[PDB]
Amino acid sequence: FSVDKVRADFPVLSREVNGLPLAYLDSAASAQKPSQVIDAEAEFYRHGYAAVHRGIHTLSAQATEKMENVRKRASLFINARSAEELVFVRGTTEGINLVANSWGNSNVRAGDNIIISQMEHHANIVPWQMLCARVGAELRVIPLNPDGTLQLETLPTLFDEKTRLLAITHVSNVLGTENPLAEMITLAHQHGAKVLVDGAQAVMHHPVDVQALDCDFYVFSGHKLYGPTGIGILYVKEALLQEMPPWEGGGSMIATVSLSEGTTWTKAPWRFEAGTPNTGGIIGLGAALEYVSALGLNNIAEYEQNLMHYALSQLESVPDLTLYGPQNRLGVIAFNLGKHHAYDVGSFLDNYGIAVRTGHHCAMPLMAYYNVPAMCRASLAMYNTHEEVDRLVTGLQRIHRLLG
Amino acid sequence: IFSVDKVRADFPVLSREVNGLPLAYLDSAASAQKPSQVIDAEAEFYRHGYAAVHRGIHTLSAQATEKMENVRKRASLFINARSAEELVFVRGTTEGINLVANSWGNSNVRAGDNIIISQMEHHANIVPWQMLCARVGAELRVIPLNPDGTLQLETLPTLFDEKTRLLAITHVSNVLGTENPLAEMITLAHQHGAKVLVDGAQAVMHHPVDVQALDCDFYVFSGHKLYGPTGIGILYVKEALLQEMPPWEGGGSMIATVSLSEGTTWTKAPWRFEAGTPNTGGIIGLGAALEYVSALGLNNIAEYEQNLMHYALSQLESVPDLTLYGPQNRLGVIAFNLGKHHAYDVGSFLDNYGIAVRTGHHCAMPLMAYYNVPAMCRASLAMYNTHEEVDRLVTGLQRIHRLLG
Numbered sequence: 001f002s003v004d005k006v007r008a009d010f011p012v013l014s015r016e017v018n019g020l021p022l023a024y025l026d027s028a029a030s031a032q033k034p035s036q037v038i039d040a041e042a043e044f045y046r047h048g049y050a051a052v053h054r055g056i057h058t059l060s061a062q063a064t065e066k067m068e069n070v071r072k073r074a075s076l077f078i079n080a081r082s083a084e085e086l087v088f089v090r091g092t093t094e095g096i097n098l099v100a101n102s103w104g105n106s107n108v109r110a111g112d113n114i115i116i117s118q119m120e121h122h123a124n125i126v127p128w129q130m131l132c133a134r135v136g137a138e139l140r141v142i143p144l145n146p147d148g149t150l151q152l153e154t155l156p157t158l159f160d161e162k163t164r165l166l167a168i169t170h171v172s173n174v175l176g177t178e179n180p181l182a183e184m185i186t187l188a189h190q191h192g193a194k195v196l197v198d199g200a201q202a203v204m205h206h207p208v209d210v211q212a213l214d215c216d217f218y219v220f221s222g223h224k225l226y227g228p229t230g231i232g233i234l235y236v237k238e239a240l241l242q243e244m245p246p247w248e249g250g251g252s253m254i255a256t257v258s259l260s261e262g263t264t265w266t267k268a269p270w271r272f273e274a275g276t277p278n279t280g281g282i283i284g285l286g287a288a289l290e291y292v293s294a295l296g297l298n299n300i301a302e303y304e305q306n307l308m309h310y311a312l313s314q315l316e317s318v319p320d321l322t323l324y325g326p327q328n329r330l331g332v333i334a335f336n337l338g339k340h341h342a343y344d345v346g347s348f349l350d351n352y353g354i355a356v357r358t359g360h361h362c363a364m365p366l367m368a369y370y371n372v373p374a375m376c377r378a379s380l381a382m383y384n385t386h387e388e389v390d391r392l393v394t395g396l397q398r399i400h401r402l403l404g
Numbered sequence: 405i406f407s408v409d410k411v412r413a414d415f416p417v418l419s420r421e422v423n424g425l426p427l428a429y430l431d432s433a434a435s436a437q438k439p440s441q442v443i444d445a446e447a448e449f450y451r452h453g454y455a456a457v458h459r460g461i462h463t464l465s466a467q468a469t470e471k472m473e474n475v476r477k478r479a480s481l482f483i484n485a486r487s488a489e490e491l492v493f494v495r496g497t498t499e500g501i502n503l504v505a506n507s508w509g510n511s512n513v514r515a516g517d518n519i520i521i522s523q524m525e526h527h528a529n530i531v532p533w534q535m536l537c538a539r540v541g542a543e544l545r546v547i548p549l550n551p552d553g554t555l556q557l558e559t560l561p562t563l564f565d566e567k568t569r570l571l572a573i574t575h576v577s578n579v580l581g582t583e584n585p586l587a588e589m590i591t592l593a594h595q596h597g598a599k600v601l602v603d604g605a606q607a608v609m610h611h612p613v614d615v616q617a618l619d620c621d622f623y624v625f626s627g628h629k630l631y632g633p634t635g636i637g638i639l640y641v642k643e644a645l646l647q648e649m650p651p652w653e654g655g656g657s658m659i660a661t662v663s664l665s666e667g668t669t670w671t672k673a674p675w676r677f678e679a680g681t682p683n684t685g686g687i688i689g690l691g692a693a694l695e696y697v698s699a700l701g702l703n704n705i706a707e708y709e710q711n712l713m714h715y716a717l718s719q720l721e722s723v724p725d726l727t728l729y730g731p732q733n734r735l736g737v738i739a740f741n742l743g744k745h746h747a748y749d750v751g752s753f754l755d756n757y758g759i760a761v762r763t764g765h766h767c768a769m770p771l772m773a774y775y776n777v778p779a780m781c782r783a784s785l786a787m788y789n790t791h792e793e794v795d796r797l798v799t800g801l802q803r804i805h806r807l808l809g
């Protein structure tokens with residue numbers, strides 16, 4: 001693995017901000033893309049473009065086949081049994097909503113309950129709140145620990161015969177905590193409950209196998225995978241997916257449509273894809289998967305882990321620095337500097353050409369647990385370097401010196 | 405004024421050869437080709453500009469956010485909405501219609517009520533209302549067709565009553581190219597206190613669209629037919645209605661506050677309806693597309709496309725056993741069948757000649773049912789299409805007629 005050869009593929013790293021070389025630590029919010037993905041999408045638009053859905057002419061057919069090929073590649077990437085177990089979505093959020101409506105409405109009833117965790121992204125919180133509101137069920141929460149880990153021993157208590165679903169995050173977008181999915185899924189299934197996994201922060205860090213996890217639902221976003229915006233993947237166990245009613249109605253998800261005799265649906269995954277999909281994004285996603293797969297995920301894991309160790313090692317020399325989350329954390333470092341407002345810190349770091357994210361990070365309960373209005377977050381991705389970490393450290397030190 | 409060559413110079417796919425022959429792409433009605441400006445806009449954004457939106461503290465994020473909202477503004481001006489806050493970013497027409505069908509429909513349509521659609525509707529403007537009607541136990545009423553491809557307008561007064569909440573109608577047919585008399589329908593619709601949703605997916609690239617003039621309550625369209633990128637579209641909703649609509653998808657960025665005890669509250673519209681990371685590249689590209697189309701001018705495009713249509717319809721009279729569907733004043737598309745031949749065979753043979761047309765039911769089955777055919781061939785004539793290509797189509801059809809009898 002060579003971070004230089006990798007950095008050579010990303011033009012954004014050449015960008016300047018406030019007159020200085022960009023150091024982009026915000027990858028957790030969205031990932032930068034290599035020229036391959038961008039050029040893949042662009043070239044598709046330039047020499048390849050037509051409509052999908054098995055049009056009679058050549059460009060359309062080839063486009064359709066490309067789309068299905070990407071579906072296959074995606075399926076192989078997360079190691080699903082069949083590509084028919086994967087659905088194209090706008091992203092993690094839509095996927096979760098789709099499950100929450102399609103599967104949730106038929107499988108969750110009055111008096112039942114769903115389980116989430118206190119570290120969840122809003123995407124993995126609100127759709128279940130909406131659901132519970134619809135059918136009159138209860139939303140139960142797995143509580144945290146001060147070190148940023150969930151309390152596993154509470155699960156036997158949270159689960160009962162009325163528990164249909166466990167919605168859990170693979171990796172925290174704030175803390176970088178990786179939850180013990182295997183244990184949770186094993187325990188969850190014993191009570192006859194399905195498990196949905198939010199992997200939006202997972203899939204780019206290391207290999208993900210959904211057969212090994214035995215998770216019932218799995219969702220993730222492409223734009224954090226160094227792919228284009230507006231595309232994501234929903235994996236669902238075939239047995240469950242085939243029995244799920246459609247969510248969005250429209251063209252291409254129907255078998256037949258009649259204004260007298262009614263309407264029938266085609267098979268999944270296609271049952272859940274209505275109207276024209278996002279083709280360019282799918283192509284770009286394919287490219288992204290190719291690129292990451294070509295670098296290899298264990299290499300990325302190794303480099304990112306060593307980089308993380310370096311960063312955490314260096315950040316110890318920063319006075320009045322408060323870190324949130326465990327030592328085994330993936331991809332992100334959440335911190336606060338003294339009593340300073342997070343946005344001021346962020347602004348100062350921005351002035352120094354360093355991009356970090358501030359605010360509640362779309363997890364309010366997580367912030368509520370730590371009794372803070374917000375946190376600073378630095379992401380260390382595969383193209384990030386020691387020099388940038390040094391810039392971050394020195395920056396924090398300078399802020400501390402200057403603002404006391 | 406308008407030069408198809410100067411315009412054609414901007415679209416690289418038109419330089420392509422297909423099955424060894426120069427491409428004639430008549431499938432624009434399915435999806436439109438993009439000029440270099442759009443493609444390069446999205447690409448350059450990705451290359452030198454890219455970050456997450458939603459008011460991140462650093463520079464790229466802020467700039468990205470403003471770019472997004474600027475595109476929203478440009479779109480509102482493009483369709484002449486009062487406010488940019490009346491516009492919602494969607495995956496395309498289908499998601500827009502579904503969003504309305506769920507969000508607005510569930511609260512505004514009840515047992516015993518009824519919705520009106522037409523027989524020429526795209527499935528996108530059919531199925532979600534079926535779903536709604538099934539959910540709340542309402543009735544779906546249909547405006548019947550005429551053999552010439554026009555709706556029977558005289559039937560409307562009877563179809564409307566005090567129980568009619570919504571008219572979901574298409575601006576322009578994706579098959580026939582029929583342009584419906586929206587103003588009349590909306591007047592009549594409003595007289596009964598009913599809302600109107602307009603499917604504009606086939607409209608917005610042909611001529612100017614003014615939603616204030618139309619006074620339509622909902623308007624939807626797709627970006628990829630407007631010569632923009634895939635996976636992006638616009639939902640226009642009257643502010644008064646939009647402000648009272650509950651959220652559909654839950655998640656980040658559409659919330660004010662989130663609590664696991666005190667519950668959850670929503671931010672203002674339109675943002676209430678945009679959950680998670682939007683499609684930023686698509687939005688940028690969409691902005692570029694709107695700029696390009698506006699720069700050419702819509703009336704110019706309308707005139708040129710009209711002359712092209714007249715030419716095509718004139719030339720197609722010399723094709724034996726050619727059956728056309730729809731009126732003479734049609735916009736943008738020509739739906740046809742050749743003798744007793746299967747549409748897909750015709751399409752394939754035309755594909756062999758380097759000509760791209762579409763076949764099948766075109767996602768309107770009832771329309772096909774009305775004409776007693778399983779499918780139709782459809783040729784699209786867009787702003788970058790030429791007389792040369794029409795000549796090629798005619799000669800192609802004639803050759804197919806020679807060969808297949």
Ligand SMILES: *Cc1c(COP(=O)(O)O)cnc(C)c1O
Nearest residue numbers: 275276496497498526578605626
């Ligand atoms: C294309 C089209 C639709 C569907 O648009 P999508 O982009 O696929 O969502 C709906 N109605 C009409 C009339 C159309 O032409």
Ligand SMILES: *Cc1c(COP(=O)(O)O)cnc(C)c1O
Nearest residue numbers: 091092093121173200221680681
């Ligand atoms: C980004 C993220 C989401 C939301 O994904 P979107 O692409 O915005 O739809 C959900 N959960 C986690 C953990 C995330 O990091």
